Amino acid sequence: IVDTCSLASPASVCRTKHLHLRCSVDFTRRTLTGTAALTVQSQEDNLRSLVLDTKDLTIEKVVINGQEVKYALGERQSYKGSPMEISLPIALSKNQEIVIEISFETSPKSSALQWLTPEQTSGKEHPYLFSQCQAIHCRAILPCQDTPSVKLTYTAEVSVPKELVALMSAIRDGETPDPEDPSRKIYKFIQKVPIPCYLIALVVGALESRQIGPRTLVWSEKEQVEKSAYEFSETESMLKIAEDLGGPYVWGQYDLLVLPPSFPYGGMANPCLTFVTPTLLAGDKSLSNVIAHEISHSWTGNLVTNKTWDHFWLNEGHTVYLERHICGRLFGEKFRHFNALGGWGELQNSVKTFGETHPFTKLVVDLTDIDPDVAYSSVPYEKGFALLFYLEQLLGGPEIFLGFLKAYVEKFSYKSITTDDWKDFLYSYFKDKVDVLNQVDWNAWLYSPGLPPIKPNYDMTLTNACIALSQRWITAKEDDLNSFNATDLKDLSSHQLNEFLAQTLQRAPLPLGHIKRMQEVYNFNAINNSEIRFRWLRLCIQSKWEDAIPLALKMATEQGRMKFTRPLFKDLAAFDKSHDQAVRTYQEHKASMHPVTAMLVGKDLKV
Numbered sequence: 194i195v196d197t198c199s200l201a202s203p204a205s206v207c208r209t210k211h212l213h214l215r216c217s218v219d220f221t222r223r224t225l226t227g228t229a230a231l232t233v234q235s236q237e238d239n240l241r242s243l244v245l246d247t248k249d250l251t252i253e254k255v256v257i258n259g260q261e262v263k264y265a266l267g268e269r270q271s272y273k274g275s276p277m278e279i280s281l282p283i284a285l286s287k288n289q290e291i292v293i294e295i296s297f298e299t300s301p302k303s304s305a306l307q308w309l310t311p312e313q314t315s316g317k318e319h320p321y322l323f324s325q326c327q328a329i330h331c332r333a334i335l336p337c338q339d340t341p342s343v344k345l346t347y348t349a350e351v352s353v354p355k356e357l358v359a360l361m362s363a364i365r366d367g368e369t370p371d372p373e374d375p376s377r378k379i380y381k382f383i384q385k386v387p388i389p390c391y392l393i394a395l396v397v398g399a400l401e402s403r404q405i406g407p408r409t410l411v412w413s414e415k416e417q418v419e420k421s422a423y424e425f426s427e428t429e430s431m432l433k434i435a436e437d438l439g440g441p442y443v444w445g446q447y448d449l450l451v452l453p454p455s456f457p458y459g460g461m462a463n464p465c466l467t468f469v470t471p472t473l474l475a476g477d478k479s480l481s482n483v484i485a486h487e488i489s490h491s492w493t494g495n496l497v498t499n500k501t502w503d504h505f506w507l508n509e510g511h512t513v514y515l516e517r518h519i520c521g522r523l524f525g526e527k528f529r530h531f532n533a534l535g536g537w538g539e540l541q542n543s544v545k546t547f548g549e550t551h552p553f554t555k556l557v558v559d560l561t562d563i564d565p566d567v568a569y570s571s572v573p574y575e576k577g578f579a580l581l582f583y584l585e586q587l588l589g590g591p592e593i594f595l596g597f598l599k600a601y602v603e604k605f606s607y608k609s610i611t612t613d614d615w616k617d618f619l620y621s622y623f624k625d626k627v628d629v630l631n632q633v634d635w636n637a638w639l640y641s642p643g644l645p646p647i648k649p650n651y652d653m654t655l656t657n658a659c660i661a662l663s664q665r666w667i668t669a670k671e672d673d674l675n676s677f678n679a680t681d682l683k684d685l686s687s688h689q690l691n692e693f694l695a696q697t698l699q700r701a702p703l704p705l706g707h708i709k710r711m712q713e714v715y716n717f718n719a720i721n722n723s724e725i726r727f728r729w730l731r732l733c734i735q736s737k738w739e740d741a742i743p744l745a746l747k748m749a750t751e752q753g754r755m756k757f758t759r760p761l762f763k764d765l766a767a768f769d770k771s772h773d774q775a776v777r778t779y780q781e782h783k784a785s786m787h788p789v790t791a792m793l794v795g796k797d798l799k800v
């Protein structure tokens with residue numbers, strides 16, 4: 194199998210075993226400058242050259258054995274960047290190693306990085322930098338085999354201005370005054386667990402920390418530290434549960450970093466330092482499933498890794514499956530089923546958005562000539578979860594299936610695998626139930642578009658109240674509007690309010706008078722919970738309420754989580770009254786946006 198997203202030599206030719214990164218962060222030039230020393234191991238005889246991935250990097254020189262060697266940058270291939278061929282001065286035989294030290298500088302427009310001016314931060318006095326390498330942006334930081342089929346260890350030394358803090362996806366190895374420049378500090382990092390390069394991460398800013406667990410500090414700007422320490426207090430209890438499900442946590446520390454609002458994702462499971470959106474700071478811990486998700490990647494994704502992005506569902510399906518077991522052990526099995534059924538609803542939404550014949554609704558996808566950022570959706574998460582939940586029910590329940598999950602993690606730890614590796618092992622583990630497994634419509638589940646061929650069984654206990662109320666609103670006539678009342682919500686959790694809105698939004702538009710009555714009785718405008726507010730504002734805009742336009746524009750621009758920003762801009766563009774202001778607002782903000790978000794919103798808006 195080929196990694197169609199990488200231009201570098203494949204793992205069948207050579208493999209990077211280690212990276213030693215020494216670099217310096219320059220906020221005036223918006224550059225990372227330094228050297229990347231790659232220890233590469235040949236997999237064949239007579240290896241005299243190799244190719245690495247790069248994207249908008251300037252190469253100063255390549256040094257092998259103290260001497261500068263020949264190298265060439267090829268033509269750029271759009272989102273994949275430019276291949277970099279390096280001439281080896283010695284021909285390598287099988288399993289021989291060499292160290293290649295590349296001197297590089299990043300472009301200020303690096304798609305892996307967002308550079309924030311002080312005005313874009315909470316404190317307003319210091320700038321800020323953060324990276325996002327998944328899926329294929331590590332090449333926009335440093336030259337590498339930018340494929341998850343290769344795993345390497347790394348150590349890093351990072352020079353920054355002394356009033357700023359640097360963190361990486363690794364164990365902190367101390368800080369010292371920069372010897373060459375007195376005003377800069379050097380932060381050291383060591384990652385002894387082999388990782389794919391998409392898990393390399395860097396942040397630099399005016400960061401403070403608070404300890405919330407024996408192996409967990411929360412990091413953020415001072416303005417958010419207190420709120421963050423409260424919101425994520427459950428982290429250690431989730432880690433303990435995750436260890437019961439997946440086996441030992443091998444990474445040492447589990448720190449959390451709360452990023453600026455422009456962070457594009459809800460979470461990123463960078464090893465030793467999960468990144469999360471500040472839109473999780475709801476004030477009541479109600480969005481902690483995101484933490485459970487990122488914790489679970491410490492097994493499914495970071496330890497057992499998809500060999501190419503075509504098999505991304507392995508990473509996300511299993512992680513959602515573990516996530517929902519963590520929340521089930523914390524809050525009960527009825528809650529696990531509630532979240533599982535909500536996930537099916539999100540799968541319905543994604544299939545409707547793409548269309549039921551669209552190739553991105555397949556579980557195993559073909560990313561040939563497809564930018565992974567453009568294909569990204571909830572399909573791998575929720576179709577993958579649905580497959581595992583269906584299998585759980587088919588094979589005798591959660592205790593039995595969790596036994597498989599732990600064996601799977603143990604079998605493929607530190608490796609990169611394909612859907613066939615997973616399925617072959619499922620059949621090996623469940624030897625005594627092969628007849629049961631052969632009842633699965635594997636072709637449909639793995640390779641057909643649209644909704645899965647069978648829907649799992651879901652407990653309805655907590656969902657029933659959401660259905661009742663959404664149906665009341667969907668079918669309401671004029672003589673029902675006065676009977677709605679704030680008491681309709683008295684026995685609904687925030688999770689049930691969110692699912693009520695999700696169910697109602699599936700049937701939007703509602704009549705405008707109905708939405709106005711909904712605000713009158715429920716005061717959803719006052720809710721700051723980002724998930725609820727998102728769905729509420731989508732419902733209002735899709736239902737043509739002009740008063741919601743400024744609220745939706747504000748939410749779309751004051752944070753940058755793509756889950757929220759992209760649909761809010763798309764809804765505003767589809768509403769005739771807000772279309773021009775949506776486009777103008779995007780044009781005015783795009784220079785200050787995260788580069789990937791700016792690209793995707795521009796595509797969405799057809800600018």
Ligand SMILES: CCCCC/C=C\C\C=C/C=C/C=C/[C@@H]1O[C@H]1CCCC(=O)O
Pocket residue numbers: 327328458459460461462486502505509558565566568569570573754756
């Ligand atoms: C669907 C085919 C595309 C293959 C992967 C392509 C792009 C993915 C790029 C970055 C992914 C970062 C994922 C971090 C943790 O699972 C994410 C939870 C946050 C998700 C959200 O707010 O929707």
Ligand SMILES: [Yb+3]
Pocket residue numbers: 224298
């Ligand atoms: Yb320069």
Ligand SMILES: [Yb+3]
Pocket residue numbers: 613617
């Ligand atoms: Yb096979």
Ligand SMILES: [Zn+2]
Pocket residue numbers: 486490508509512
């Ligand atoms: Zn994930």
